[PDB]
Each structure stands twice: as structure tokens, then as C-alpha cells.
Amino acid sequence: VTNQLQYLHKVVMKALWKHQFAWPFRQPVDAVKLGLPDYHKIIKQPMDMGTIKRRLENNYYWAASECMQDFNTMFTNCYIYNKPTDDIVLMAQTLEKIFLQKVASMPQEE
Amino acid sequence: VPGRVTNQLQYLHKVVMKALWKHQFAWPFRQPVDAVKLGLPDYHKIIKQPMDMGTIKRRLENNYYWAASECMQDFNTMFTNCYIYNKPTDDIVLMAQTLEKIFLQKVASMPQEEQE
Numbered sequence: 001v002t003n004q005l006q007y008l009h010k011v012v013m014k015a016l017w018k019h020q021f022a023w024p025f026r027q028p029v030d031a032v033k034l035g036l037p038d039y040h041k042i043i044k045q046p047m048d049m050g051t052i053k054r055r056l057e058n059n060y061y062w063a064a065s066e067c068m069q070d071f072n073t074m075f076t077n078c079y080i081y082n083k084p085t086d087d088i089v090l091m092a093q094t095l096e097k098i099f100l101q102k103v104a105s106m107p108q109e110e
Numbered sequence: 111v112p113g114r115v116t117n118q119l120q121y122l123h124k125v126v127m128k129a130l131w132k133h134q135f136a137w138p139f140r141q142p143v144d145a146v147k148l149g150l151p152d153y154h155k156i157i158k159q160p161m162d163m164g165t166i167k168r169r170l171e172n173n174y175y176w177a178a179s180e181c182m183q184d185f186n187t188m189f190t191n192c193y194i195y196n197k198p199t200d201d202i203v204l205m206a207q208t209l210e211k212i213f214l215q216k217v218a219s220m221p222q223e224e225q226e
């Protein structure tokens with residue numbers, strides 16, 4: 001537990017987890033269920049909010065920039081895998097914009 | 111009267127942007143994408159909001175941003191355009207990821223309270 005990590009749990013994750021666009025990112029991408037047979041050929045580090053939330057709850061992270069990187073990876077995976085015109089890209093952009101807004105007011109010192 | 115000068119914006123300019131700019135992978139990002147000179151006739155059909163570190167640097171220098179998050183959004187847009195336009199296997203994608211990680215590392219150390 002640091003001040004920065006607690007801000008990411010209570011302020012950042014809280015904001016994002018309950019968002020109306022959050023639902024495709026709450027659990028790991030299931031390639032079989034989603035019909036995406038190349039997903040893991042293209043994405044080598046899958047990431048999702050459920051994993052991140054769990055990690056925060058279980059005190060997995062030693063620094064806030066670590067947790068921050070998990071959020072970025074999740075969003076980046078989405079942009080790299082999907083087609084430019086897909087709704088999901090649009091949903092990821094919206095969520096990423098809230099992420100950065102909250103992260104701007106995050107405590108400076110670990 | 112677009113924006114002002116804050117502590118966070120001074121930090122994004124002198125500490126975050128400076129590091130990224132001088133990075134060995136930064137060269138494709140220092141100026142707007144010239145789709146003609148590069149032979150990418152579909153760029154502007156796919157990327158609706160072009161952004162580059164040259165534009166962000168100028169905006170910082172002319173007090174265009176009102177708050178830090180506005181400048182952060184511009185950084186995010188630059189990185190996202192790259193991921194969205196380019197093929198997953200392209201070198202450019204790897205370069206952007208590297209820069210994006212540094213950006214996040216340095217944003218984590220930005221002053222918490224925005225003061226004019």
C-alpha cells in the first residue's frame with residue numbers, strides 16, 4: 001500500500017469499473033467465446049480491469065507506475081488488435097480519457 | 111486566452127516532453143505526419159485527429175493548454191493514432207509503446223496539485 005496505489009484503487013478503478021463502457025474490459029479476452037482465433041498471436045500481453053482490480057486488492061504492485069502500465073497495456077492491446085472503426089476502440093478511448101484525467105490529480109510521492 | 115502557465119504544465123514541458131523528444135525512438139513523432147512525403151494516401155482517412163510532439167511542444171510554449179490533462183490527452187492521441195493506423199508487427203508500434211511507457215513513468219512523478 002502506498003498513497004498513489006490507493007488513489008488508483010479508490011479513485012481511478014472506481015471511476016472506470018462502473019463506467020457504462022467498462023464491460024468489455026472487466027474480464028480477460030476469451031478468444032474462443034469472442035471468435036478471435038488470432039488474438040493471442042497478435043497480443044502477447046493480454047490485460048484487463050479484472051486482473052488489475054484483483055492485483056490492487058491483493059497488493060500485487062510495488063509501485064503506482066506498475067499499475068499505470070497495466071491500464072495502458074489493456075488500452076493499447078485494444079487499439080493494436082481491433083479495426084480503426086470498431087466500437088470497442090471508441091469505448092477504450094473514452095475510458096482512457098478518464099484514466100488520464102484522474103491520473104493528473106494523483107499524489108506525486110510514493 | 112486559450113490557456114495559462116501551471117506547475118504541472120511546466121513539468122510536462124521541461125521534464126516529460128524533454129526526455130521523450132531526445133529519445134532514440136522519437137524521430138517519427140517530432141513533426142506532423144506528411145502522408146504525401148511518406149506514401150500513405152489513406153492516413154487522413156483513418157486518422158481523424160493527427161497529433162505529434164512538435165504540435166504539443168508549440169502548444170506548451172504558447173500557453174495553449176488550460177490544464178495538464180489537456181496536454182496529456184494530446185500525448186495519448188499521438189500514441190493512439192500510431193496503434194490504430196499501423197500494422198501490429200510494424201517497428202513504429204514498438205517505438206510508440208516504448209515512448210508511452212516513459213511518458214507514464216514520468217507523469218507518475220508530476221506534482222499532485224495544479225497551481226497557476
Ligand SMILES: C/C(O)=C1\C=C(c2ccccn2)c2cccc[n+]21
Pocket residue numbers: 023024025029034036077078081082088
Ligand atoms: C478488449 C477487446 O479487444 C474486446 C472485448 C470484446 C468483448 C465483446 C463482448 C463481450 C466481452 N468482450 C471484444 C469483441 C470483439 C473484438 C474485441 N473485443
Ligand SMILES: C/C(O)=C1\C=C(c2ccccn2)c2cccc[n+]21
Pocket residue numbers: 137138139143148191192195196202
Ligand atoms: C506516427 C506514424 O504513424 C508514422 C511516422 C512515420 C515517419 C516515417 C518516416 C519519417 C517520419 N515519420 C511513419 C511511417 C510509416 C507509418 C507510420 N508513420
